[PDB]
Amino acid sequence: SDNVFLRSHTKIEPLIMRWYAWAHLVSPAQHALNIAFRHLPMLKSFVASPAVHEAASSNPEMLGGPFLELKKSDAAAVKALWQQTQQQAGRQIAFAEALLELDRRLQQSETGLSLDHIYAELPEPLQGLVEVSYDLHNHPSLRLIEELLYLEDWVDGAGQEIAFSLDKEEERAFFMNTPRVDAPGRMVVPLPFADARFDLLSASRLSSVSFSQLADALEIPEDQRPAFREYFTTSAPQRNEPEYEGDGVRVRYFGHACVLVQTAEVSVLVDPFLTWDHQPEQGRLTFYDLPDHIDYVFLTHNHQDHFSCEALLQLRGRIGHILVPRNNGNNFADPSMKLTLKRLGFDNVIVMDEMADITLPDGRLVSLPSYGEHSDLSITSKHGLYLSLKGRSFMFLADSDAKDRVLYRRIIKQVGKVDNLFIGMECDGAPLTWLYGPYLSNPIGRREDESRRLSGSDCERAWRIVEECGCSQALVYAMGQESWFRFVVGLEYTPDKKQIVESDKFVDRCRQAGMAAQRLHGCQTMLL
Amino acid sequence: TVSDNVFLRSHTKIEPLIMRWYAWAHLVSPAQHALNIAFRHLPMLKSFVASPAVHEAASSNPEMLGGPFLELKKSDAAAVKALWQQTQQQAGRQIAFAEALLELDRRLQQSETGLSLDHIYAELPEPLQGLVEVSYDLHNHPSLRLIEELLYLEDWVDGAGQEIAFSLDKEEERAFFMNTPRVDAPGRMVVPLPFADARFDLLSASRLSSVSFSQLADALEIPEDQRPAFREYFTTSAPQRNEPEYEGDGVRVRYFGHACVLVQTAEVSVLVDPFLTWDHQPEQGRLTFYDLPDHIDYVFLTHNHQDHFSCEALLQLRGRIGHILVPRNNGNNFADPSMKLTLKRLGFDNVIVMDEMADITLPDGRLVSLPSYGEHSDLSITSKHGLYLSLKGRSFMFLADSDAKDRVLYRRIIKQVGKVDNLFIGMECDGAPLTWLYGPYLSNPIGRREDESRRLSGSDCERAWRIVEECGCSQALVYAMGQESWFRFVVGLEYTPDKKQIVESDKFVDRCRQAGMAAQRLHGCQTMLL
Numbered sequence A: 001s002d003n004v005f006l007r008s009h010t011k012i013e014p015l016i017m018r019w020y021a022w023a024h025l026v027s028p029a030q031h032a033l034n035i036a037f038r039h040l041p042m043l044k045s046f047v048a049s050p051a052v053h054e055a056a057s058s059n060p061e062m063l064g065g066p067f068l069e070l071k072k073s074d075a076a077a078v079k080a081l082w083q084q085t086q087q088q089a090g091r092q093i094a095f096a097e098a099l100l101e102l103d104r105r106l107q108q109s110e111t112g113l114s115l116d117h118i119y120a121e122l123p124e125p126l127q128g129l130v131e132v133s134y135d136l137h138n139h140p141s142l143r144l145i146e147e148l149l150y151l152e153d154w155v156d157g158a159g160q161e162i163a164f165s166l167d168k169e170e171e172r173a174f175f176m177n178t179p180r181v182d183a184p185g186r187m188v189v190p191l192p193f194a195d196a197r198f199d200l201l202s203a204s205r206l207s208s209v210s211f212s213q214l215a216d217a218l219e220i221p222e223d224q225r226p227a228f229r230e231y232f233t234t235s236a237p238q239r240n241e242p243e244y245e246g247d248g249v250r251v252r253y254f255g256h257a258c259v260l261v262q263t264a265e266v267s268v269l270v271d272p273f274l275t276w277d278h279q280p281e282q283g284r285l286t287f288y289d290l291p292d293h294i295d296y297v298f299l300t301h302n303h304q305d306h307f308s309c310e311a312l313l314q315l316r317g318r319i320g321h322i323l324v325p326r327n328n329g330n331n332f333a334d335p336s337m338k339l340t341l342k343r344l345g346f347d348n349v350i351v352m353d354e355m356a357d358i359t360l361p362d363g364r365l366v367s368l369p370s371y372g373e374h375s376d377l378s379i380t381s382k383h384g385l386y387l388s389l390k391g392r393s394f395m396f397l398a399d400s401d402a403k404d405r406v407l408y409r410r411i412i413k414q415v416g417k418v419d420n421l422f423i424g425m426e427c428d429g430a431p432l433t434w435l436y437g438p439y440l441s442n443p444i445g446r447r448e449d450e451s452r453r454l455s456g457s458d459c460e461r462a463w464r465i466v467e468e469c470g471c472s473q474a475l476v477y478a479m480g481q482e483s484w485f486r487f488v489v490g491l492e493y494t495p496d497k498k499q500i501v502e503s504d505k506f507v508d509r510c511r512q513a514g515m516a517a518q519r520l521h522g523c524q525t526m527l528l
Numbered sequence B: 001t002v003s004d005n006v007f008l009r010s011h012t013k014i015e016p017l018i019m020r021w022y023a024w025a026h027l028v029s030p031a032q033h034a035l036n037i038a039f040r041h042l043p044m045l046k047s048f049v050a051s052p053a054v055h056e057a058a059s060s061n062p063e064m065l066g067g068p069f070l071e072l073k074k075s076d077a078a079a080v081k082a083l084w085q086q087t088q089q090q091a092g093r094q095i096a097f098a099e100a101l102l103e104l105d106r107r108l109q110q111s112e113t114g115l116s117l118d119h120i121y122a123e124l125p126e127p128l129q130g131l132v133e134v135s136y137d138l139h140n141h142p143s144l145r146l147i148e149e150l151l152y153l154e155d156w157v158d159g160a161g162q163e164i165a166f167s168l169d170k171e172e173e174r175a176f177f178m179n180t181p182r183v184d185a186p187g188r189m190v191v192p193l194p195f196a197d198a199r200f201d202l203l204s205a206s207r208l209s210s211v212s213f214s215q216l217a218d219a220l221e222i223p224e225d226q227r228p229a230f231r232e233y234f235t236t237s238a239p240q241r242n243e244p245e246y247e248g249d250g251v252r253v254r255y256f257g258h259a260c261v262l263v264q265t266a267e268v269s270v271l272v273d274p275f276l277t278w279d280h281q282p283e284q285g286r287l288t289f290y291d292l293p294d295h296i297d298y299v300f301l302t303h304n305h306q307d308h309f310s311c312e313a314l315l316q317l318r319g320r321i322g323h324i325l326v327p328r329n330n331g332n333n334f335a336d337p338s339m340k341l342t343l344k345r346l347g348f349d350n351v352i353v354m355d356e357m358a359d360i361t362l363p364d365g366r367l368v369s370l371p372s373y374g375e376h377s378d379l380s381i382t383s384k385h386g387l388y389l390s391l392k393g394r395s396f397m398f399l400a401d402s403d404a405k406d407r408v409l410y411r412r413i414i415k416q417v418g419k420v421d422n423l424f425i426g427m428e429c430d431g432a433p434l435t436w437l438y439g440p441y442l443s444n445p446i447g448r449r450e451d452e453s454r455r456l457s458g459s460d461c462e463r464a465w466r467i468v469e470e471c472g473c474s475q476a477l478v479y480a481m482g483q484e485s486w487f488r489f490v491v492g493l494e495y496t497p498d499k500k501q502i503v504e505s506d507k508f509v510d511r512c513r514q515a516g517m518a519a520q521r522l523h524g525c526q527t528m529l530l
């Protein structure tokens, strides 16, 4: 009689070689580029002077910078992981080094003549995996045949683990800064993400599971099992109205860019990033407050604050279809989100082109074109969402930057007028290299780096969408102001920050036009 | 009482025309169509109206076949000038889009070197607003991505200019497809009909099933003055068919010419690169359009070239194809329009866009979409893919004009799909230069050696032998050579035995037979059992 649930606040943190698993560590090409040109430099730089990294991590303004949030005591662990990563990922570092070295060579040497000679001189890690081509101006680009790369022998479950923890989410270290080294209260269990055993682990969130059977499946030493039992409880988790049986449309804003739309017949989840800590003063909606079945999960783009492998892995058997955008195969920074999801065990993945629609009970959903927020890189894995359910029209644009009002004019011509606009106002994002640094074979200038930021719409540009779509309500979302997103989004915005000032300008101009408008802060359940 | 239930005459050809130009894939896609109207079609017509004799001089030269010269001659000058003035009025929005697109692309290449591109959208000309996204590659080179899904809903993307040319002349008389516009001429009756129009499906039904002539002419809005002449393309007799269906327990393969190959079990049919003939000739032992089964489960399109993507063959097969399989396109390249979107404008929504190594299950087997390299002048065109086919134990690999530049690539494929029994390879290893096909899409002219260095070239003897060694086929068949007569107007001259393509193919078939394999260069139609 060992039927146990996961404790409601037990966090299942997925780790790839102790680094928090975000999308680019799951796709192999970007993972190799991140091991060799992000993780190894930060780990080696930490070993040389741990004091340097605490000093940068102490200054809260540069919270996301390339420095570990670890302390001098963890020096032994960092150096060990740095050496472990050298031997474990030897094929990865050879691929990343060979891939970038090829890319530098082509820029210098290929000027418009035939590229047939290149395939003869391809290094072994790239042989049969890369196609060399030109644009219409004799600039070479490297196109990875990702489907063949995913079947390479070094694309395995090695390094994939899970970190059980009971600490509050505000305690999480930054996802790209800090590896999850061994710590008290943190129990790391080796487990491939696509493994069936994970499905048994995800079942214990909402359904009772035998503890000994689960601990046996999870290869848990019996000496460590008393400590592993701490993450489990006999009581079932409390859930705040997961289902909805009204004839209307219920929208639940779960924080940042996570918003669930629900009729009594369909559920649509946009950019799932959830919390497992309940805290009533903030009136949180948690992972448990989601319905048992989510018909459609919509992934706007491939950023860590909209693509949470932690949330998706525990929601695997509960998701009818994941809706993703198409990727640009000719760009290293744009891996296919299907495949990345396939490696996480997801085959219910629909790649949607622009203006592609799916018919839903009492309505439809359309994948909309989106511009920007990717440092002006030819990344195409971005799309907005038009949602129609029982007469109510919704448009979620996430961090899309409305550079061209005529684009949304053309969009409204097909999908019609929208009732509720969800727009993100992160208009001062990180520079290019903060995210796409390890993928650059040749470094970029600081003026170029600071001009192309991960920035969305400001007040003026967001007003273009409102004018074109004629919404009665405009909701500013995807601001990252809730507490449990600090470890992914960064600092909470003080009222003087441009993102808060511009957002305040936008809500005011909307109300001046006679619409309902607000900046979402804290979780909210709305009926409409 | 005047009961005239009629079929289409077996040798009646229905030539789809977009402003009297033979409609191939790039004239159907609007952006490339606009670029071809302004930067290929309009120049050739103006060049014809000024000294048409120059065009007669090049059209006499059999070497300069397909060159930028009309195969019309001087009597058609009055007709050509009208079309040159007519298309100028009709395609005003098209030329304005093409001029703005190339001028924009020229501007960004000159000035945008790595700083933010946000200013570009404010200075976008009206033909491009809301339709193009400006972006960088990883080396600060700007690219233009047309939102093709939005462009296809633009106001000038309509059925205007789309017609069909009924003619009874042998395919042997056809003018080159992009050389020469189909001006009004005797024996050619041009009927206005949009390609995606439902009425087109009714006309295609008249190929194999009888329809009332008066009812058919009424739908196609044929004026009663023209109906006596329209009756010439129709016959009361039913068309003759050479064993179209297959109910045998084996696998029947039928070679229809060039790269068109039909594979058939008793339970599924797969058509590769449909390019058919409507002229019967038993002396050549032709397999014709009518010899295809009534229903084609799967039509597989290797890539987006005129000799493998025939709107003529596909339009009459509408409603007869379960699913058309196409490769994915790179939206950041002008020369790579989406083949799904091009087919949607032809009335096909049963279009499955297949990624690399994507497989679909078939009765008694499956097919896999294979990676393919080259034959696109080293341009970032991704709308190309090979086909692995397994049916009742028989394994096929159709590679069309694939250039095996990387032997390990096919090694990796064989690790997944297994050994192949029958390989279909093209040895067109001296194709046309880059500008012959993608000329109007260059914002800045390209140098002549670079143009001739990167040709529409496939596998030669060595590279095709790389595939054979990697896949271990018991049979190797050289196809997609353009050796059949009815492929003039698309492929060009027949290759004499001294031409590089024939010498390399003969060398390859020789090395195959020396190894104990079966090999031949497919010439003329063939029905094979396996």
Ligand SMILES: [Fe+3]
Pocket (backbone or CB within 6 Å): A301, A303, A373, A399, A454
């Ligand atoms: Fe983002």
Ligand SMILES: [Fe+3]
Pocket (backbone or CB within 6 Å): A303, A305, A306, A398, A399, A426, A478
């Ligand atoms: Fe974001």
Ligand SMILES: [Fe+3]
Pocket (backbone or CB within 6 Å): B303, B305, B375, B401
């Ligand atoms: Fe071709």
Ligand SMILES: [Fe+3]
Pocket (backbone or CB within 6 Å): B305, B307, B308, B400, B401, B426, B428, B480
């Ligand atoms: Fe060909």
Ligand SMILES: [O]
Pocket (backbone or CB within 6 Å): A426, A428, A429, A430, A454, A455
């Ligand atoms: O950001």
Ligand SMILES: [O]
Pocket (backbone or CB within 6 Å): B375, B401, B428, B431, B456, B457, B458
């Ligand atoms: O070709």
